[PDB]
Every structure is written in C-alpha cells, then in structure tokens.
C-alpha cells in the first residue's frame, strides 16, 4: 500500500474513457456489420443517414481479459477499502503496475463477469439524490445466468430473490430505512436498454428482464418455478452502443450459441417520484457501457510521474 492520501473520482475517471474507446476499436475489427447507419447533419435539421456496407464475417466474438499497465512517466494508483464510494479521498491507496484482468463485457441492465464486491453488496452513484444518475450495484456474490441462442436464459430464482433483497436492503440504507423498496421493469426506451441486452457468440441477445425486476417489498414469485427463465431474442438489426445509429449483423449460423456468465452487478435507476411517500421505484438501467467500465475502474486512477 502507498503511504499517502489522494482523491479519486470513478465518475470522472479518465481510464474509463480510455478503455471504452479501446473496447470500441476492439469491436471494429471483430464484429463488423453488413450495414451501419449513422446520423449526418450539418445542423440544418435535415439529416442524411451515412450508410456503410462491409463484409459480415460470422466470428464467435469471445472477449479476452484486458490489463492496463502504466507505460512510463505514468503510474496507476489503486484504492483499497471494503466499501469505497469511488468518489473521494482514499486512505489505503497503493501504486500498481497493471489493473486486474478485466473482461470487457458490453451489456445493459446486468453486469456480466465483472468483479465481485469483497465485503458486501455496494452501490455507487455519482449522486443518489439525482434520479437521473445511474446507480451501479456491485454484487458480493454473483448469480450465474445461462443464455442460449435457443431463445432464453435461466437464472436461479433463489439466488435472484436473495440478491434483490441484499440490494433492496442496501438501497434503503441510502435513501432512508423507513422507505419501501420496489423493483419495476424498464420505463421505456430502446430495446437494448429495456431488456437485458448483451452479446454472446457474436449474437446480440435481447432478454426480457421483467421477471428480474418486478419485485415488491412484500410478495414473492416461486410458485411452480425453480429457475427464472428470461425469454431472450437474438436481433440482427440493432442500435449501436458505440455511436448513435443502427447496424445490421448477419443471421446466426453455428449449430449452437451458449453463455454462462456471472451476474456480478447491476445498473439500476430509481425514478424521481418528486419527493413522494417512501416508495422508491428502481428499474433496470444502463446502455452507457462506460458505467460498465466504471464499475471495474471505480478504484483506479492513472497519474503522471513526479
């Protein structure tokens, strides 16, 4: 550990933007659409769409862990604490060569294969007061989730029920104990944000996460169900996360696509409610892959040599 006190701000961390831009370029030479449409305006309202048609090679895009080592004239500083807001003065900081192996998983609503919370479930937010700022949840115990191009994902109803609890409890432990915690599905928006979207085998899965976010701080949902089955769908025409615009990928082909990932975290986003009675409603969120990266770099910060 480094014997000094420094400031950290994962919400304004620059490595996030440095990885994000990398992960995008890690996408332009691995997953290339058959056609990519992107807004093109002079400002005069009228906006032509810039079209691009390239080969559409079916590749089973399988993410490789990524390290981030400071070159020279530069040093990475890691924060150490069982519960770090990731936005303030860190006491147990410590210089490191490369950040832990991170598997740049691009997804929405659920953070897959990320890094678990050592102690307990932690939830960071650039401002919990602002019903506009994504709440990044960090699970201390991942929940396996298996998706298949066959059309769905299975999740443990047990583990997910617990998780919502040990999350619902960490929420009121920030918005007011004497406050009811509820979970509802997406409010609306793009398919990629409304469902738990992500990529598996180069196939863009779109799983309906209603059964994962319709939890009332009162009842249950395990009648005749051992596992939660999200009705997933693979799309060819998708909205790009790298930049405003659609993109069409070629249909599936491999006799079988399969994924078994660790739900290591979520991206929630409680609704304003305009100071109404203690009844905070949290819904799935994300779509801004940087929050993802953040959830992984929340305790890092590269700095110039002295």
């Amino acid at each position, epitope marked *: *550990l*480094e*014997n*000094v*006190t*420094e*400031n*950290f*701000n*994962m*919400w*304004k961390n*620059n*490595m996030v933007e440095q990885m994000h831009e990398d992960i995008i370029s890690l996408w332009d030479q691995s997953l290339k659409p058959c056609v990519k449409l992107t807004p093109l305006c002079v400002g005069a309202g009228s906006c032509n769409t810039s079209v691009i048609t390239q080969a559409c090679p079916k590749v089973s895009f399988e993410p490789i862990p990524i390290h981030y080592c400071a070159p020279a*004239g*530069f*040093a990475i*500083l*890691k*924060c*150490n*604490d069982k*519960k*770090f*807001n*990731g*936005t*303030g*003065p*860190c*006491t*147990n*900081v*410590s*210089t490191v060569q490369c950040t832990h192996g991170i598997r740049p998983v691009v997804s929405t609503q659920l953070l897959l294969n990320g890094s678990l919370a050592e102690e307990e479930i*932690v*939830i*960071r*937010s*650039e*401002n*919990f*007061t602002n019903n506009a*700022k994504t*709440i990044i949840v960090q699970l201390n115990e991942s929940v396996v989730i298996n998706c298949t191009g066959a059309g769905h994902c299975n999740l443990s109803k047990t583990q997910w029920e617990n998780t919502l609890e040990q999350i619902a409890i960490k929420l009121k432990e920030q918005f007011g104990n004497n406050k009811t915690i509820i979970f509802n599905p997406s409010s609306g928006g793009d398919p990629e944000i409304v469902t738990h979207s992500f990529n598996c085998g180069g196939e863009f899965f779109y799983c309906n996460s209603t059964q994962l976010f319709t939890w009332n701080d009162t009842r249950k949902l395990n009648n005749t169900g051992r596992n939660i089955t999200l009705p997933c769908r693979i799309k060819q025409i998708i909205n790009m996360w790298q930049e405003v615009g659609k993109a069409m990928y070629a249909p599936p082909i491999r006799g079988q696509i399969r994924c078994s990932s660790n739900i290591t975290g979520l*991206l929630l*986003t*409680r609704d304003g409610g305009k100071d109404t009675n203690g009844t905070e409603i949290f819904r799935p969120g994300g779509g801004d892959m940087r*929050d993802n990266w*953040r*959830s992984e770099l*929340y*305790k*890092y*910060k*590269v*700095v*110039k*040599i*002295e």
Partner: antibody
Amino acid sequence: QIHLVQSGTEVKKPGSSVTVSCKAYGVNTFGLYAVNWVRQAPGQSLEYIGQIWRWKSSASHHFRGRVLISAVDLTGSSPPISSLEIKNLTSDDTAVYFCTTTSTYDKWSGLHHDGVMAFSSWGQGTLISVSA
Amino acid sequence: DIQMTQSPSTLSASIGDTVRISCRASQSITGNWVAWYQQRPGKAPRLLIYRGAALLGGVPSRFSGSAAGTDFTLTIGNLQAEDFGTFYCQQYDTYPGTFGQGTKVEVKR
C-alpha cells in the same frame, strides 16, 4: 475535470460530534487518488488533519483518537465520497474544513513523497462553527 | 515537525511588477518537496507550483519557483490583477506536511 463538492455549513454545540462529506466528481476511484483533509481557522493559516491513501486512513498527532476518516467508491447516482468525523467538538474546532485530492497513480510525479503530499484539487470548504 | 517561516508578512505592489516571496524551512529539504498555493478572499486555495519549481497544468508561466540552502522562493513576474491575494508555502518532505503563515500581496497606492 475534478470538482470536489463538500457538505454544507454546520453550527454545532460543544461536546457534540459532526461528519462532513466530500463528493469527488471526476475522481475514478480512491484506489488511484489520495484524500487529504485540511482546516483553516479564521484569519489563520492552514493545518493538516489526516488522510486516506490506498484505502488506508490515518490522522496527525494533534487529532489522533478524535477523528475518523473514511472513503467509498460509488457510481451512477453518486461519485466517490470521502467523509471526516470529528468527536468532542470545542471552540478551537471552529474553522473551514477542506477536502483535498491528489492522484497517486504515477510514482514519479513529484506531487507525493511516501504518503506526504501536495494537494492538487480543493473543495469549496465547509464552515463548522462551534457555539452554544 | 518541520517549521516553515514565511517572509514578508505583507507586500504592496503594482500591476506589471516582479514580486518575491520567501520561505525558510527549519531543516534542509534535499528532495525539494515544497509547494506554493494562492488563496483569494472567500475562496479555496489553489496549487500553483510543486516540487519547488514545477508548474501545475493551467498555471500561468509568470509564476516560478526557486531554492537556495534552506530558503525557497516564489517569484511573480508581470504582476496581474487576478494575482493579488494571499500566498502560502508548504513542505511535504516529512510527516506531517506543514504550511507557512502566509503572505498578503496588496495593491500599491
């Protein structure tokens, strides 16, 4: 761009305790930035209080046993936050408390020397006025 | 702890002047672990120079730092309106870091 946003002014009775907060907008993680707290009594110069560095906290001789300093990484709703707790307030605790941040990522930088450092970003300050 | 004694307590200057503020450390500081800050009335200090002579990003180059023996000095060339206020030196050579008593720079008349 780093903006440090401290909690608001407080008026506190002697013997009481208070916790002041600091939201570190632009700060990634306190794994890469140290927090140093500092205070300035009215018409006085500045005095070091304590720090959290690499998730390890500590306090200067004059304040040891009376002060707890903590930090937590957060995202979405909030940026990373550090806080300073002060116990048994007296009149000579009345002052402006500043939270302060310095990146520790680059060992060669010269902003820091084995845990003792210069302070590159400052909050607005929070006045704690101690009075009956 | 290291004591920093700052000199002078106040000085009066005009726009366009060159100004010198000095700080004597009670011990030698081989590493040059010294910093200078500006504070304007009502506001938080700002770091101007660190490691004795290094300019922080965004600070005008009319500011410079120097050292001789146990003395460290801030120089301000072409004194400007926004420069008036109070300046502090700080050692971070040894724990705990400590500040000078400060120097007030006001307008000559």
